[PDB]
Design a protein around this ligand. Structure first.
Ligand SMILES: *[C@@H]1O[C@H](CO)[C@@H](O[C@@H]2O[C@H](CO)[C@@H](O)[C@H](O)[C@H]2NC(C)=O)[C@H](O)[C@H]1NC(C)=O
Ligand SMILES: *[C@@H]1O[C@H](CO)[C@@H](O[C@@H]2O[C@H](CO)[C@@H](O)[C@H](O)[C@H]2NC(C)=O)[C@H](O)[C@H]1NC(C)=O
Lengths: 98, 209, 98, 209
């Protein structure tokens, strides 16, 4: 069903991304967050049991993740040196349990 | 506060303005050949799309943002960078303005947009607004309509508000007076100056909003 | 590219799954494991920076996961009480960075 | 060791046998109405698919696995459960074997498979193999070919190896001898018994492999 994996958002400065840009522009960053335990399979249950069983040695395979399946539009901004930058696939648009 | 920076923030926080702002910054900054910094066609096309699809409160908010200094300030340089002039405006060759006008008038849209600019921003010093048509919004609409044509105007590096298409009156011959009249309609137009200033004020003027 | 996310397998007893069945039958369990850092986006980088920045408060959104996109055929087995059981979506068939 | 359990393990470790084994266990154990434990049609169909598509070393390994005790053991009960008899075999009504034979002979495939069984597993006590056709593999093929028809046979609860379709000779009338001959070809057939035993041995016999 994956109803727990939702789309959240936060208002941030571009500098809050810590990507190296020097600018005073802002953005709305959107991300996918929430539990996906109702969309898990026998595979995910077996994983959980084998981690606890230590039967997979040191592999820690991933169970169902709350992830973006579609990304928001590109965002652009002008830095202090008057150079434009464009970021692609930076923000989530729609979520799903994967 | 930096009004041009505030307008850029408000745009990126609006889904419509953010999308179409990036939709023109990408083609106006993407090199596609070793000889040209950009595809100027696609840059002008996406610029026209931005002003056609983005509501004026965001699109005019960036294009007509007010700054204290018209040159060297962070405000004014950001305002000058609104149309990405390194691609949309600055050019190797600087044509004569009258020659550029002949070229514009052979394009149906350029001819239509230029006629609207000369009609709606016509000065009238007897008017308290400074315009013949006491409707600043129509002047601002007609002027912004030139962005994306061969008549694309931009702010000049001046202490005052002064704009012009990428042209001059060098080598005009026997038509120097006619050329000077053409450029002065851009660079020294009290109607256009008042309209731009009235928007930047962000107040309920008698001839705007 | 997601070339690090691979399909691994392990030979196990059915009891090793800890799903409650009492049987001596066996199976080959296949799972997806490996890094996906070459398939990450600006979104995943921003996530990593915001976790370290503490700017997302307590949300710990998931970055690109190594997950199954197709599951193996169903498996059946007979338990000690002579009852048949069938497990579906228990084993991975093909992997991808998601 | 439990040979039937070892055969089940080897099957689940083989991609082909694992797939088609589950492909018949699901329809033979899935209730689809409040009146029947299974769709018997789909159970027989998937059983036929298992023996047609799975190589004999895996399919015969489970069907003809050898056990010390023919009843009550974990081996022998697992072997009896190979065809999921609660759906494929056991039935509310137990027909007369001769009546079941008439019904089988009206089906082109059932008639063909039954004729192959009576031909290939025909006993001959003069032969050192016990069969008229000294080829145990053909007998095992013809017998397993009956699984999925109305003549589906299964191991009976007996100290020896003894098989039979779901029928008996009650209410045969004037044809009691003919019915008893029919069932005895299943339940007391030294050729079929030798063929099944020879496979379970897993050795290079003169009449097998
Ligand atoms: C962007 O950064 C500015 C500057 O750091 C942030 O404004 C500050 O917010 C903090 C705490 O919330 C205040 O204590 C600072 O004094 C503020 N500084 C100024 C100059 O106002 C602003 O909140 C940030 N914006 C976003 C959306 O993150
Ligand atoms: C299934 O379980 C059996 C029984 O526990 C496992 O065989 C054992 O393996 C361990 C350690 O590898 C040995 O020390 C035990 O003595 C073995 N027991 C017997 C009876 O052999 C077997 O390895 C398991 N099989 C799988 C595939 O996990």
């Amino acid at each position: 069903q994956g109803r727990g994996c939702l789309l959240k958002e936060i208002h941030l400065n571009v500098t809050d991304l810590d990507l190296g840009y020097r600018t005073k522009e802002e953005l709305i960053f959107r991300y996918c967050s929430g539990p996906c335990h109702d969309a898990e399979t026998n595979y995910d249950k077996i994983l959980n049991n084998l981690t606890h069983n230590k039967k997979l040695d040191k592999d820690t395979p991933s169970r169902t993740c709350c992830r973006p399946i579609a990304f928001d539009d590109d965002i652009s901004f002008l830095d202090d040196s008057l150079e434009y930058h464009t970021l692609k696939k930076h923000s989530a648009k729609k979520c799903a349990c994967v | 506060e930096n009004n041009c920076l505030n307008a850029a923030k408000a745009c990126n926080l609006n889904d419509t303005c953010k999308k179409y702002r990036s939709a023109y910054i990408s083609p106006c900054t993407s090199r596609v050949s070793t000889a040209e910094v950009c595809n100027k066609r696609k840059c002008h096309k996406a610029l026209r799309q931005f002003f056609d699809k983005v509501p004026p409160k965001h699109s005019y908010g960036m294009l007509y943002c007010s700054c204290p200094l018209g040159d060297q300030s962070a405000c004014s340089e950001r305002r000058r960078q609104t149309i990405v002039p390194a691609c949309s405006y600055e050019d190797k060759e600087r044509p004569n303005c009258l020659t550029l006008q002949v070229s514009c008038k052979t394009n149906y849209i350029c001819r239509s947009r230029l006629a609207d600019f000369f009609t709606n921003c016509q000065p009238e010093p007897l008017s308290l607004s400074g315009c013949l048509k006491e409707n600043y919004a129509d002047c601002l609409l007609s002027y912004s309509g030139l962005i994306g044509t061969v008549m694309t105007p931009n702010y000049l590096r001046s202490p005052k508000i002064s704009v012009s298409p990428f042209c001059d009156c060098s080598s005009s011959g026997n038509s120097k007076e006619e050329c000077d009249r053409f450029t002065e309609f851009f660079t020294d137009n009290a109607c256009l100056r008042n309209a731009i200033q009235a928007f930047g004020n962000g107040t309920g003027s008698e001839f705007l909003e």
